[PDB]
Design a protein around this ligand. Structure first.
Ligand SMILES: [Zn+2]
Ligand SMILES: [Zn+2]
Ligand SMILES: [Zn+2]
Length: 139
């Protein structure tokens, strides 16, 4: 049945935790890495996206964006807009962009969940902005 450390929640074979003390994308992912096989959350299916949405939906109006583990280390130079990858190195096998970055001139190079989409869809976002964030890890 999957158990998790007190303070996180189980889904599938992973544990998930929302952190409200805001960090840049890089610093948030580094914080997640303190946990066993930890990284910013990767969203690998619609079902997982729904779970993550439910984890964060009660966050409160102080917050409209939450970091997830997707970033573009090509900083937009990938010829197709497809340099995006999960920090966990999982295959990108599910896509839930609010707006596809390939349609935006000079998009942000990290991705967040947006309150406007009930935290179900991804918004390109400035990596240097400090946001709350969700970690996905094993126990
Ligand atoms: Zn894992
Ligand atoms: Zn990377
Ligand atoms: Zn740029």
């Amino acid at each position: 049945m999957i158990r998790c450390p007190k303070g996180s929640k189980a889904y599938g074979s992973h544990c998930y935790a929302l952190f409200l003390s805001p960090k840049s994308w890089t610093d948030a992912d580094l914080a997640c890495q303190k946990r066993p096989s930890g990284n910013l959350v990767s969203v690998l299916s619609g079902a997982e996206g729904s779970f993550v949405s439910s984890l964060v939906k009660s966050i409160g109006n102080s917050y409209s964006y939450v970091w997830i583990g997707l970033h573009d280390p090509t900083q937009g130079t990938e010829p197709n807009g497809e340099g995006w990858e999960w920090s966990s190195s999982d295959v990108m096998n599910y896509f839930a962009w609010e707006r596809n970055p390939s349609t935006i001139s000079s998009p942000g190079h990290c991705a967040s969940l947006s309150r406007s989409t009930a935290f179900l869809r991804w918004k390109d976002y400035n990596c240097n902005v400090r946001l709350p964030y969700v970690c996905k890890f094993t126990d």
